[PDB]
Amino acid sequence: MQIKTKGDLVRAALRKLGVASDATLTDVEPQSMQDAVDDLEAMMAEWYQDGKGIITGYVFSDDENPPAEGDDHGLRSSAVSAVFHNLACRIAPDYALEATAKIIATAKYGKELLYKQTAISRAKRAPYPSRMPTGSGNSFANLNEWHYFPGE
Amino acid sequence: MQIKTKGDLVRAALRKLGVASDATLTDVEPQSMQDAVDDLEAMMAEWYQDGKGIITGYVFSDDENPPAEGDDHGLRSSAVSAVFHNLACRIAPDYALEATAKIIATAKYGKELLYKQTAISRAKRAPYPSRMPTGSGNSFANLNEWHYFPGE
Amino acid sequence: MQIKTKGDLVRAALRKLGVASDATLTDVEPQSMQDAVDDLEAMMAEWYQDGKGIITGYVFSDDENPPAEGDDHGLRSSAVSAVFHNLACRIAPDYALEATAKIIATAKYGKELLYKQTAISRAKRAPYPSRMPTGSGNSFANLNEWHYFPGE
Amino acid sequence: TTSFSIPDVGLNGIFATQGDISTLSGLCRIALWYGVNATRPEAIGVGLPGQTA
Amino acid sequence: TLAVDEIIETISAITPMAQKAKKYTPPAASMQRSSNTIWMPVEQE
């Protein structure tokens, strides 16, 4: 993938928004790039609710390494489009812009696809209640089989 | 098919958008191809969710090969229209454009046709539960001494 | 029929769109003609899902013979109208156009009429289950000892 | 497993069936162990007609 | 298809030599240790 850093995500988002791209004649300043990377970090921390939200493999930059930009985002190949579309939607108000309908729809679809597999994994059925019996079918086999279910 | 590379897919999408075609005397700007190829790769990675999404035979370029443009996409002949229509819809916001209603409808129809066969294949019925008897009429089960189904 | 080639289908679609015909003083370039032929090929490949889609007798040109335009389409005389109406609908966005209501309605009607006979053919009822008895009324089946239907 | 008594020849073998549940299949096998011995080769003979040149 | 309940019999073999051959069953427990072989004496001269 050609997108491998937080700045690559930011540049893709700006290209989607039409603010700045490679073919452009006027570009945005590095302070604005850093602000966009900061907004990306804020959105990622909001999504990954300390491990109880959307899992993507995003790696949060530490203060010791000076530029947050330049770090590999760590996302899988299937998450990049959703990430930078949502970032473009979030940073559109910065440049007096509003993201278009196609961008909004793609961002919604990308976030849903991001959480689909985690939802499948988290959809688990609880164990048996602590007061249920194991049944007499589970008594002749495993002669020391429990009479009641543990629970918890 | 005469659309055999990511470049042909990108050029078809641009022409559908009316950005760089022959019906209008506009040549493909070199930067209008790299960004479109990036968008196509991102969309394909998003669709083919590491094997659990839409299977299309698309071949993802690796970091070793320098030019992403120029590779055979590997798609079947029945997927090209959907691919380039969706690509045009995705890359329309770059030029402050908006894909027309016909292009959007064709994209929807093509995506549905793309997933139709995969849906047919994945519409599989689960095996019998572990607690069913096989019945007394199951000659094979009686021969193999299986009074109950194995499940799993 | 007067329309016997892919180029003829493309020219008919263009005339229906009102862009280029045999009476106009301006014409479309051969590159546009060839690429419209490419679009028609992509459409037909999408429709005919490798044998599981809309069967029309369309013949896909091979790369060994260079000019795809100039190849007999192979369609029956009743499929030409639907084919070129849908082609006009799909290649209208190339010229910053939108197919008119009459063209849209004719394309829909033609596609439905194209698939009518295939749908009638494919509306087949499943054989008897392997768990149903043939019944005693079938004396020959009872004597040949075919007490239960074969199935499959 | 059960026995498997061949008629004509007065021999006995085994007949066994097994079932694999992972693949929902089965196997069948009819085994027979024996050995033909010639205790007196000086008594057995062979007639060879038309052994000219 | 309703395969008729008749069978076209094709082959009919006969085994006279195996029927006339005398059949011997030595003790299995001893043969296992003796490696499936057993010795028999020969008429003395």
Side-chain angles (χ1 to χ4, degrees):
Chain A
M1 39 188 148
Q2 281 296 290
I3 297 153
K4 302 201 262 235
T5 89
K6 308 188 201 322
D8 281 74
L9 301 173
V10 164
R11 293 193 277 284
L14 287 171
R15 178 192 79 226
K16 284 328 307 173
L17 263 182
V19 158
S21 65
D22 277 19
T24 201
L25 304 174
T26 89
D27 199 312
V28 80
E29 260 163 51
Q31 173 67 57
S32 292
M33 201 85 48
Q34 184 180 257
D35 296 355
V37 174
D38 203 342
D39 284 336
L40 164 61
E41 298 276 285
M43 155 178 89
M44 283 309 191
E46 165 150 306
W47 282 11
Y48 179 81
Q49 286 273 315
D50 288 320
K52 331 199 84 62
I54 308 187
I55 271 73
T56 47
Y58 190 88
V59 169
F60 295 101
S61 43
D62 40 31
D63 294 303
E64 195 270 305
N65 212 257
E69 165 40 23
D71 291 306
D72 311 37
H73 37 53
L75 321 166
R76 19 191 182 79
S77 208
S78 66
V80 170
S81 153
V83 167
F84 80 73
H85 269 109
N86 271 267
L87 183 52
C89 274
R90 288 268 198 134
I91 72 183
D94 281 43
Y95 313 85
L97 252 59
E98 186 60 53
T100 190
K102 177 58 193 194
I103 290 176
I104 290 177
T106 314
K108 295 166 60 45
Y109 174 71
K111 217 187 140 168
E112 203 247 335
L113 229 57
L114 225 41
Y115 195 68
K116 174 186 293 179
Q117 300 300 324
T118 316
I120 281 181
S121 147
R122 269 169 202 180
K124 260 188 321 296
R125 205 195 254 291
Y128 268 109
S130 42
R131 285 179 281 188
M132 255 272 293
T134 37
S136 150
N138 312 301
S139 94
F140 90 110
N142 315 334
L143 53 96
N144 264 42
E145 203 28 74
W146 315 341
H147 295 103
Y148 275 72
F149 274 118
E152 177 196 272
Chain B
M1 58 219 194
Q2 280 302 289
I3 278 154
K4 307 195 257 236
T5 52
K6 315 187 198 311
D8 323 283
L9 280 171
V10 159
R11 290 192 272 282
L14 287 167
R15 161 174 62 78
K16 273 312 172 283
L17 272 175
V19 160
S21 83
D22 196 314
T24 57
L25 292 119
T26 311
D27 306 336
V28 162
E29 324 195 316
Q31 303 104 0
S32 275
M33 181 105 60
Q34 212 139 347
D35 299 345
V37 162
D38 277 3
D39 270 41
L40 171 72
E41 292 275 290
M43 159 214 296
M44 281 315 178
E46 160 150 304
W47 286 4
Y48 177 77
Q49 283 282 326
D50 292 315
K52 332 195 69 76
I54 307 189
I55 277 77
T56 47
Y58 191 73
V59 202
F60 293 101
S61 43
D62 47 48
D63 315 298
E64 200 213 289
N65 192 239
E69 155 47 357
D71 297 308
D72 303 358
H73 43 55
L75 298 149
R76 23 197 183 79
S77 209
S78 60
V80 176
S81 154
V83 168
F84 80 72
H85 283 113
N86 266 279
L87 185 49
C89 281
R90 284 231 171 181
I91 70 179
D94 286 21
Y95 318 95
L97 286 194
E98 179 66 59
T100 202
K102 178 61 194 198
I103 296 173
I104 294 177
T106 319
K108 295 155 63 45
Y109 178 62
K111 221 183 143 167
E112 255 270 3
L113 294 198
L114 264 187
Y115 197 71
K116 174 186 293 177
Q117 293 291 320
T118 318
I120 274 147
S121 156
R122 292 224 195 85
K124 265 193 318 291
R125 200 196 257 292
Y128 275 101
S130 37
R131 287 184 286 191
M132 290 215 78
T134 50
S136 325
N138 253 298
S139 296
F140 201 39
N142 288 6
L143 162 75
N144 275 308
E145 230 279 348
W146 299 337
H147 304 324
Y148 282 75
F149 280 105
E152 187 198 276
Chain C
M1 58 221 182
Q2 292 293 289
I3 304 150
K4 299 205 254 233
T5 37
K6 300 182 191 317
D8 275 348
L9 291 172
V10 167
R11 276 181 299 269
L14 271 163
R15 179 194 76 228
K16 204 43 52 173
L17 277 171
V19 166
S21 160
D22 275 303
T24 89
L25 315 165
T26 82
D27 216 276
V28 277
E29 248 183 22
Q31 169 90 40
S32 286
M33 223 81 90
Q34 183 182 265
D35 163 351
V37 174
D38 279 358
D39 273 15
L40 155 79
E41 292 267 287
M43 178 209 275
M44 291 306 166
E46 146 161 309
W47 279 10
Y48 171 78
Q49 293 273 315
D50 311 3
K52 295 157 210 282
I54 300 183
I55 273 74
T56 47
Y58 192 73
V59 198
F60 300 102
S61 35
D62 60 54
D63 324 296
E64 190 263 306
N65 185 260
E69 153 173 82
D71 270 283
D72 315 344
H73 36 51
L75 308 152
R76 34 201 161 91
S77 203
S78 67
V80 173
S81 160
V83 162
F84 87 77
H85 277 108
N86 281 275
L87 188 50
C89 271
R90 259 148 161 278
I91 81 194
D94 271 14
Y95 311 64
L97 280 198
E98 184 69 53
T100 199
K102 181 59 195 199
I103 297 179
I104 295 174
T106 325
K108 290 154 58 47
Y109 175 71
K111 217 183 139 173
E112 258 271 0
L113 226 66
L114 267 189
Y115 193 62
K116 170 179 293 180
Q117 228 63 30
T118 309
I120 277 193
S121 150
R122 280 171 198 195
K124 264 192 301 292
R125 201 200 256 280
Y128 273 110
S130 100
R131 265 190 289 182
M132 189 171 220
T134 41
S136 59
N138 309 103
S139 50
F140 49 93
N142 259 24
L143 297 194
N144 300 332
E145 217 254 341
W146 276 101
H147 291 121
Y148 285 72
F149 274 112
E152 191 205 2
Chain D
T1 317
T2 54
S3 198
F4 193 87
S5 83
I6 310 276
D8 270 347
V9 200
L11 286 175
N12 266 292
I14 79 184
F15 164 91
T17 88
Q18 193 156 280
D20 202 5
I21 196 65
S22 172
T23 174
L24 298 167
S25 302
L27 295 139
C28 215
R29 170 179 209 151
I30 298 169
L32 171 43
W33 206 10
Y34 64 100
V36 179
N37 271 270
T39 40
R40 319 176 29 204
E42 60 266 9
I44 323 175
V46 152
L48 285 172
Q51 302 290 343
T52 198
Chain E
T1 295
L2 17 116
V4 110
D5 243 34
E6 254 235 342
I7 272 283
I8 315 283
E9 78 285 69
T10 279
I11 39 185
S12 88
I14 49 192
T15 81
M17 271 185 277
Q19 175 206 291
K20 297 169 52 59
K22 174 282 201 193
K23 318 191 168 51
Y24 186 42
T25 322
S30 87
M31 274 266 275
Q32 149 172 36
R33 268 142 183 277
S34 80
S35 166
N36 296 316
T37 204
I38 175 154
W39 299 82
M40 332 176 106
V42 170
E43 299 121 16
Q44 168 145 11
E45 164 87 9

